[PDB]
Structures are given as structure tokens and as C-alpha cells.
Amino acid sequence: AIETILVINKSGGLIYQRNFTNDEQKLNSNEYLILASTLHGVFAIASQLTPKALNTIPYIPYVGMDDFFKEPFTNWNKSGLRQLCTDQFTMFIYQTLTGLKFVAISSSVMNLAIQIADNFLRKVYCLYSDYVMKDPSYSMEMPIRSNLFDEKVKKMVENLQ
Amino acid sequence: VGPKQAITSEASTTYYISRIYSESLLFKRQEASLSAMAFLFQEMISQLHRTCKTAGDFETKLSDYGHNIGIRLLELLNFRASVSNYITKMRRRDLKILDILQFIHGTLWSYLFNHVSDDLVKSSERDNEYMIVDNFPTLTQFIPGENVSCEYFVCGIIKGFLFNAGFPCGVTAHRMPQGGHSQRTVYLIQFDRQVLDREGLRF
Amino acid sequence: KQLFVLRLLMVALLATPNKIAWHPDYRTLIDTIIELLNINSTWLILQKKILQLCIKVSRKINDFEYVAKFSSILITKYTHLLNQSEQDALFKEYIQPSITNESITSYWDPFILREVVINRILDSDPTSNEIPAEFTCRVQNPFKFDFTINDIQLDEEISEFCEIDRKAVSYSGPYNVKAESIRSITLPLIIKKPTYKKIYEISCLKISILKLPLQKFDIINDSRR
Amino acid sequence: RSLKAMGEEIWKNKTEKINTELFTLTYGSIVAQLCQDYERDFNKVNDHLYSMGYNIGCRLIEDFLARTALPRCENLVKTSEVLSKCAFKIFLNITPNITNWSHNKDTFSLILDENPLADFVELPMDAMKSLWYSNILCGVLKGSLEMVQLDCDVWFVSDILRGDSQTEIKVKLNRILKDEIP
Amino acid sequence: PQYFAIIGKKDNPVYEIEFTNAENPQGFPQDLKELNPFILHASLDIVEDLQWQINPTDNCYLGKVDHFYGLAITAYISYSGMKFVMIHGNSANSSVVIDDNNMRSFYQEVHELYVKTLMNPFYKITDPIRSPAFDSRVRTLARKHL
Numbered sequence: 026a027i028e029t030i031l032v033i034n035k036s037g038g039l040i041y042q043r044n045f046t047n048d049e050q051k052l053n054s055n056e057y058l059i060l061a062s063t064l065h066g067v068f069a070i071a072s073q074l075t076p077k078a079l080n081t082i083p084y085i086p087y088v089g090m091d092d093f094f095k096e097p098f099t100n101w102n103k104s105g106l107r108q109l110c111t112d113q114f115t116m117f118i119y120q121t122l123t124g125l126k127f128v129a130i131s132s133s134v135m136n137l138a139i140q141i142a143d144n145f146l147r148k149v150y151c152l153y154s155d156y157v158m159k160d161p162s163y164s165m166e167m168p169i170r171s172n173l174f175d176e177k178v179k180k181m182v183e184n185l186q
Numbered sequence: 187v188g189p190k191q192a193i194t195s196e197a198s199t200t201y202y203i204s205r206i207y208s209e210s211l212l213f214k215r216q217e218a219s220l221s222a223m224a225f226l227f228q229e230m231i232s233q234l235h236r237t238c239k240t241a242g243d244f245e246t247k248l249s250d251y252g253h254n255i256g257i258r259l260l261e262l263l264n265f266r267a268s269v270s271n272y273i274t275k276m277r278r279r280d281l282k283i284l285d286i287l288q289f290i291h292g293t294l295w296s297y298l299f300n301h302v303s304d305d306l307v308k309s310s311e312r313d314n315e316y317m318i319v320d321n322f323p324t325l326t327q328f329i330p331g332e333n334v335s336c337e338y339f340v341c342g343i344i345k346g347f348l349f350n351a352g353f354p355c356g357v358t359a360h361r362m363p364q365g366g367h368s369q370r371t372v373y374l375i376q377f378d379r380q381v382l383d384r385e386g387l388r389f
Numbered sequence: 390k391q392l393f394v395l396r397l398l399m400v401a402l403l404a405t406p407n408k409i410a411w412h413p414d415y416r417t418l419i420d421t422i423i424e425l426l427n428i429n430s431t432w433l434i435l436q437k438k439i440l441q442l443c444i445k446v447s448r449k450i451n452d453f454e455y456v457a458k459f460s461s462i463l464i465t466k467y468t469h470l471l472n473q474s475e476q477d478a479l480f481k482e483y484i485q486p487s488i489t490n491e492s493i494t495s496y497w498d499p500f501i502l503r504e505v506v507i508n509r510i511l512d513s514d515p516t517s518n519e520i521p522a523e524f525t526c527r528v529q530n531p532f533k534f535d536f537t538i539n540d541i542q543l544d545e546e547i548s549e550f551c552e553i554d555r556k557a558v559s560y561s562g563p564y565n566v567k568a569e570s571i572r573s574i575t576l577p578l579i580i581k582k583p584t585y586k587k588i589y590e591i592s593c594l595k596i597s598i599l600k601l602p603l604q605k606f607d608i609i610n611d612s613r614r
Numbered sequence: 615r616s617l618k619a620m621g622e623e624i625w626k627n628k629t630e631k632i633n634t635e636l637f638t639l640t641y642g643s644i645v646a647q648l649c650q651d652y653e654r655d656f657n658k659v660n661d662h663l664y665s666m667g668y669n670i671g672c673r674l675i676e677d678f679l680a681r682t683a684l685p686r687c688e689n690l691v692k693t694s695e696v697l698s699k700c701a702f703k704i705f706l707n708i709t710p711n712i713t714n715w716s717h718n719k720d721t722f723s724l725i726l727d728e729n730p731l732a733d734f735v736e737l738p739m740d741a742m743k744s745l746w747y748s749n750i751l752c753g754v755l756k757g758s759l760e761m762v763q764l765d766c767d768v769w770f771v772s773d774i775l776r777g778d779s780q781t782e783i784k785v786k787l788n789r790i791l792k793d794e795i796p
Numbered sequence: 797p798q799y800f801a802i803i804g805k806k807d808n809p810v811y812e813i814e815f816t817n818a819e820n821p822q823g824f825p826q827d828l829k830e831l832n833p834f835i836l837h838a839s840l841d842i843v844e845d846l847q848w849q850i851n852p853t854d855n856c857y858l859g860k861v862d863h864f865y866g867l868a869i870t871a872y873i874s875y876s877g878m879k880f881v882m883i884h885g886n887s888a889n890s891s892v893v894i895d896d897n898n899m900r901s902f903y904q905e906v907h908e909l910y911v912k913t914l915m916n917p918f919y920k921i922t923d924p925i926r927s928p929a930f931d932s933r934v935r936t937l938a939r940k941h942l
Binding site for chain 4: 207209211214215216217218219220221222223225226227228229230232233250251254255258259297298299300324
């Protein structure tokens with residue numbers, strides 16, 4: 026259901042883009058960076074609406090057949106954008122405590138629907154922090170040029186659908 | 187017993203048990219995580235790409251660490267495998283090349299990485315060259331190994347397992363995907379002619 | 390074992406009270422004693438003993454360039470392990486016959502002068518440079534002290550005088566230096582002269598120790614220009 | 615408790631474990647080559663191995679928070695001592711102990727009972743005075759807690775192999791704002 | 797009157813020491829300099845062409861090996877590179893006594909003192925050992941087996 030994944034660094038810039046299974050393109054690189062800068066600008070102001078004028082945990086369904094940690098975990102994203110839905114796609118956001126934002130955009134629709142696309146996105150943040158965090162070519166906050174990263178998340182797109 | 191001084195000392199007619207620091211040396215088990223040692227190796231390779239010029243000098247300036255601790259792991263790995271210390275015996279030393287590259291194959295990898303490298307192939311065309319392939323190398327599995335300069339920790343660590351053994355040896359690594367096992371690395375080692383000719387006296 | 394039995398051959402030649410003038414195989418015998426080692430092995434006290442035996446053969450058979458050669462190589466390549474005992478006080482008497490011969494040159498140590506200062510002495514009130522780390526020397530007397538490291542005495546410094554620069558050259562030095570210490574020096578006494586004023590640097594100067602005049606002994610661990 | 619028990623639980627997961635002898639030998643070889651190369655400048659190897667520690671202090675905490683999905687550490691002392699007491703044992707299987715506070719528990723110490731970085735090192739007689747053997751931990755803890763925005767100031771004050779009987783690290787916590795948008 | 801040596805790969809003595817029985821109260825006066833490296837240098841020669849063959853199952857220990865015209869020598873070869881040599885014997889008698897098993901429980905017993913000093917990562921190869929403690933340990937480890 027998911028067809029493109031981005032990751033964002035904490036200083037408001039794109040890190041990685043892969044248009045996985047859409048296979049007709051019109052977007053080159055810096056327009057995706059325009060999306061990355063604008064979602065960082067949106068996620069700036071998207072807490073202080075405070076419309077209330079005043080414990081929530083995610084869960085465990087075992088996405089991606091083992092998994093890494095079989096427990097209903099916490100999440101740091103208590104105030105801000107989580108997901109969007111339009112008539113042609115839907116999009117997802119997961120932040121870390123450190124500051125990396127973890128985009129996933131899905132063309133079809135896939136409560137529980139945020140929670141499955143949260144449970145996917147803890148796995149790739151584990152997979153980010155084992156396969157390009159431990160890499161001496163990777164200087165900090167740069168793009169990802171590990172091909173070893175890229176098929177190991179390309180395998181997990183077909184381990185989703 | 188200094189280099190400047192002689193071998194001079196005193197008589198045996200006393201008993202000086204004033205000792206400080208000597209302990210056990212046995213096979214302890216503490217088993218740290220691969221992320222921690224991977225980060226140690228990670229910032230080490232970061233320092234070596236910082237301080238060094240080009241390919242080959244960086245390859246030597248990686249393999250020198252293996253030459254530092256290869257002697258050290260050789261002698262008590264042999265002192266544990268072929269032998270406090272209420273010692274029965276110490277068994278046979280290196281007879282030839284084919285027991286000592288069995289000794290990397292037998293109990294060096296299973297000392298380090300809890301398994302065995304899958305082959306110890308004697309080469310076809312020559313005999314000075316030998317080749318060991320690890321199938322899925324443990325300490326460099328995260329590095330995208332298109333440059334094969336990052337696995338010269340272990341070429342340095344086996345060269346210092348054979349330089350004490352009296353076989354000076356050109357040790358290289360290549361990587362070749364011969365199977366569905368991907369990113370398996372071949373350590374095609376060589377020797378010199380002379381201990382090959384010391385083998386070539388009689389075999 | 391061949392070096393062991395040839396060492397016994399050489400101690401047989403020391404203990405023999407018969408008399409010998411030199412036979413042209415002792416060339417090759419002492420050459421092969423030296424080249425069963427690799428010396429031009431890191432067992433240094435063996436080198437001390439086997440060079441002491443070679444020096445005693447070359448005394449008893451009187452090949453004076455070889456007692457020159459091998460005792461100069463003994464003094465240069467060793468003697469951190471030679472204090473005033475183990476016959477270094479009863480040595481250097483063994484090489485004043487080298488230096489009263491024409492045998493050795495150059496004074497083997499290239500570390501003699503520890504530093505250089507040309508510090509002044511004020512005489513008059515306002516006879517100074519009143520309008521102009523360089524020196525621009527004022528008519529006075531210098532002092533440049535040195536060290537020895539070889540703990541023998543009698544290294545008589547003579548004719549300490551400067552290099553190929555101007556008439557600023559030292560006068561005389563008729564006294565010796567000490568056995569061990571970094572000895573202060575007495576009166577170099579430059580006889581400086583007003584010339585043209587462009588900058589002319591020294592590094593060191595020639596020294597002779599009862600011997601031939603050397604070149605500039607470059608100062609330690611630095612230029613110290 | 616919860617955290618104390620899930621430390622021994624989350625020791626058992628996917629990425630395999632290897633024996634500490636290799637890790638100790640690698641660290642000893644790095645510090646021996648750096649002690650040889652800088653001509654016994656033991657002050658300079660302290661800050662070089664400190665920056666060596668801090669440059670994986672920047673990158674340890676992402677693997678820590680990924681492999682251990684853990685919430686925000688709101689208490690700045692008691693949660694900190696119990697998380698570091700489990701959080702060495704997730705990486706290098708050791709359980710340090712914590713005493714020697716301030717009045718407000720600010721400059722607290724962390725006594726390590728037994729060190730796997732030097733099981734068997736007898737550091738030499740010239741290197742008594744201006745060296746600590748294991749300041750890479752002072753690198754990696756200051757990095758690993760600066761990336762959760764806690765401006766620590768670690769330093770060694772005593773170890774085993776400088777002569778003393780306890781291995782501990784004192785730490786002054788300054789304060790720093792602008793975490794994220796939560 | 798006993799003389800220990802550990803002699804390295806490029807002929808360097810990494811540890812060499814004498815001691816004496818007080819029943820002798822001195823050691824080999826005027827013979828202490830020919831029974832040094834030259835005899836031991838030839839002992840390096842005979843263990844050089846005695847180690848690499850199988851046959852003149854205990855490949856390390858070798859026992860008594862040779863004999864100059866005043867005494868006789870013993871040996872040991874480790875796979876660390878090092879070749880341990882003890883030189884024993886009262887100078888009056890030709891000392892025959894090779895215990896051969898209890899001083900086999902010295903060479904594998906002094907081996908770990910070399911091991912733990914080799915495991916000092918500041919300690920290099922091809923440099924001698926001024927341990928103030930490991931040399932005081934071995935004479936008391938030779939107080940076990942005189």
C-alpha cells in the first residue's frame with residue numbers, strides 16, 4: 026500500500042527518497058526537498074493551535090514477517106502532525122526523541138490505520154539506526170548512499186503488502 | 187634485568203612474596219553487544235580515513251592493529267585449545283601449513299565469531315597461494331563493501347597469526363559473490379618462497 | 390657454535406706468551422668474527438665482549454687502523470652501558486695511541502655544543518645604540534658552553550674559533566673540559582670588526598680536541614641559531 | 615522493577631552478541647598505537663580518545679532508543695541512574711553502581727565495579743600521572759546525553775590502574791533548551 | 797648457581813638472570829662469562845635446527861640438549877617465538893641431575909608470567925621486561941623447584 030518513503034533530519038532537510046512502486050515519475054530531487062522544508066515548516070506550527078484551550082501508547086500486531094520488540098511501546102509525538110489523507114493518497118509522520126521525522130506516503134488507504142503505519146515506522150527507524158548509522162562513509166546529516174540500506178527497506182515494502 | 191645492566195642478581199636464600207598483580211586468565215564470558223563493538227570499529231575507521239592519504243597506506247595502517255594483537259591472541263588461544271593452570275600438557279605446534287590454517291579454521295573464528303569459515307581451499311594452479319572465504323563477515327556487515335578496504339582488520343589479524351608461526355605471508359582480501367550467500371569475502375593469502383621451500387625440502 | 394670456537398681461538402691468541410707480527414689472515418679472521426654478527430642481532434652485551442676481544446687482538450698483533458676502526462665503532466655505537474667501571478676509566482688510554490698516531494680523525498661525537506649566547510658587558514653610560522632576536526653586536530665578550538657525555542676526562546678543547554664569516558672570530562681556549570658534566574667555557578673573546586651591515590647568520594663553529602679542525606657542530610634538537 | 619527486568623529481557627533480541635575479549639583487545643591496540651604515536655604525550659591521548667568517544671556518543675543514542683523503545687526521561691537524576699545502570703548492560707554487560715551525590719544530587723558519581731576495557735592491563739610507570747585508560751566512556755556518555763539535550767560535564771577522578779581502588783566519574787549537569795516540537 | 801634466560805627471535809634476551817645457592821654463596825667465579833651468551837648463542841643454534849623437525853608427543857618441552865666441557869644445558873621452545881633456557885649446576889661437580897618433570901613444572905609455570913606481561917598492551921615485542929614484580933616472582937617460583 027505504501028509506495029514512497031522519505032526520512033527527514035532534525036535540521037529541516039530531506040535525507041532519502043525512494044519512489045518504490047509507482048514507476049512513472051515527474052518529480053526530481055529538489056521538489057522533494059521543497060516538500061521536506063514545507064513539512065518541517067508545517068510541523069513547526071502544527072502544535073500550538075492548542076484547540077482544547079487547556080497514557081496513549083501504540084501496540085503490537087507483528088508487521089513485517091521475527092520482529093524486533095514484541096510489546097505495546099510508547100511514542101514521543103504527543104502534539105503535532107501524525108497523518109494526512111487526500112483523495113489520491115495518504116501520508117504518515119513519525120518523529121523520534123532526537124528529531125528525525127520519518128515520512129511514509131501510501132497511494133491507497135491502509136484507530137488501527139495509523140497504528141499499522143506506526144508499527145512499520147519503528148522498524149525502519151531501527152533499520153536506519155543499524156545499517157547507515159554504522160557506516161563510515163556516512164558523514165552526518167547527509168544523504169544515504171548505502172545500497173545495503175535500500176534493498177533492505179525495499180524488501181520491507183513487500184513485507185508490508 | 188635491564189638492557190644497560192648485566193644479568194646480575196642475588197642469592198636464593200630468602201623468600202620475597204611481596205607481589206601485587208597476578209590473577210586468573212581463563213575463558214571468561216561477558217558477551218557485549220555487536221552495536222558497541224561495531225561503533226568501536228566505526229570510529230576507528232573514521233580516524234583512519236581522517237589521518238591517511240590514499241588506499242594502500244590506509245590498508246597497511248589498518249592491518250598493523252591486527253599485527254599488534256595477532257601474536258597475543260595466538261599464544262593464549264593455543265594455550266587454551268592445545269592445553270592457576272594445573273596443566274596436563276601442551277600439544278603439538280605447527281607441523282606444516284595445513285594444520286595451522288586448519289587452526290584458524292578450527293578455533294579462531296569460533297573463538298571470535300562463534301562459527302566456522304566455510305572452506306579452507308588449497309589453490310588449483312599454485313601452492314604458495316591459499317584461500318579462506320568467510321561467508322558473511324560479522325564485524326563489517328554494515329559497511330557497503332564495494333570498497334573492500336574495510337575488511338583488512340582480519341587480514342591483519344591472520345597475518346599476525348602466521349608471522350609468529352614462521353610463515354611470512356602476503357595476505358590479501360577480495361570479495362566475490364559465488365553463491366546465494368551474498369558479500370562473501372575471500373582471503374586469498376600467499377606465502378614467501380623460503381618457508382615454502384622449507385616445506386619444499388621434504389613435504 | 391662457530392662463533393663460540395672462534396672466540397676460543399682469539400682468547401688462545403691473547404693467552405699465548407709467544408710473540409707475533411701480523412699475518413694477512415687475521416684481516417679475514419677478525420672480519421668474519423664481526424660478520425657472524427650483523428654489526429656494521431640486538432644482544433648488546435655480547436657486542437661489548439666480542440669487541441673487547443677484537444680490540445685486544447688488534448693490540449697484541451698491532452694492526453693500528455683496526456684498533457682505530459673497532460674502538461671508534463665501540464665508542465660510537467655503545468657506552469650507555471659503560472660507566473667509569475667496566476674498564477672505561479682504564480680505557481681511553483687505549484686510544485691515546487690512536488690519536489698520537491695518525492689513525493682516527495674528526496672526533497666521533499656530533500653532539501658537543503649545548504647552546505650559544507653572545508651576552509654582553511656594559512662599560513660606558515650612553516655609548517649604546519640609541520635609535521637602532523638579532524644582536525647588532527656592541528664591543529664585548531662572548532660565552533658558548535658545551536657538554537660532554539662520554540665520562541672520560543682530558544678532552545682538551547683547543548682553538549675554538551668561528552666559521553667563514555667576518556673578523557668576528559674567537560681568540561683562544563687553552564684549557565680542557567670535564568669528564569661528565571655540561572662544562573661552562575672560558576673566554577672565547579670575539580675580535581669583531583665594523584663591516585657592511587647585511588644579515589649574516591651563524592649555525593656553529595669549528596672545534597678541535599687535540600686533533601684536526603672540524604666543521605660546525607650543529608646544536609642539539611633545534612637550530613638554536 | 616519494570617525497567618530493571620526489561621533490561622535482562624531486551625538483552626535477548628535479534629542482533630547477535632560477541633565476546634568482550636575482542637572488544638577489549640581492539641581498544642587496547644588503539645590506545646597502544648595512539649600512545650606510541652604521540653611520543654608519550656599522555657595529555658594529548660586523553661583528549662584524542664575523548665573525541666574518539668564523543669564522535670560515537672553522537673551516534674550511540676539512536677540505536678539505544680531504537681532497539682530500546684523508551685520514553686522521555688523527565689527526572690534528571692534517579693531515572694538517569696537507573697537508565698545508565700541498565701543501559702551499560704544492554705551494550706557492554708556490566709552493572710555499575712551509583713553513589714556520591716551533591717546536596718541536590720547534581721554532581722553524582724557512577725562507580726563501576728569491574729571494568730571490561732582493562733581486565734588485564736598494567737599501564738607503565740611513566741604513564742602513571744597524565745593518563746586515564748578509559749576516557750572513551752567519558753566521550754560516549756557526554757555525546758549520548760547531549761543528544762537528549764542534557765549538557766553534562768563528565769570527568770574521571772579515580773580508577774583501578776592509576777593506583778586507586780574505585781573507578782568513578784563525576785558529572786556536572788548544565789542545562790539546555792530547544793529539544794524538538796513534541 | 798643457576799642462570800635463567802629468555803632469548804627472543806632476533807637474538808635479543810628479553811629476560812636474563814642469575815642466582816646462587818648460599819651453599820655456593822657465589823656463582824661460577826671466572827666461568828660466569830663464558831657460560832653466558834656464546835654457549836647460549838650456540839644453544840639458540842641447536843634449538844633452531846631442533847624445533848622445526850618432528851624428530852631428533854610434547855613438541856614444546858625438550859629437556860637436556862647439549863654439553864660443553866664443564867656442564868650441560870637444558871631448553872624449552874614456546875610457539876610465542878620465545879626459547880626459554882635455564883642454566884643450572886654447581887661448578888665443582890659435573891651436575892648430572894635433570895629432574896625432567898618437576899622442572900617441566902617450571903617452564904609451563906613461568907610461561908603464564910610471560911603471558912600476562914605480553915598481554916600488557918603497552919608492552920611491545922622485542923623489548924626487555926623491567927618488571928620489579930615478575931622478576932621477584934620467579935626466584936620465589938624457583939623456590940618451589942630449586
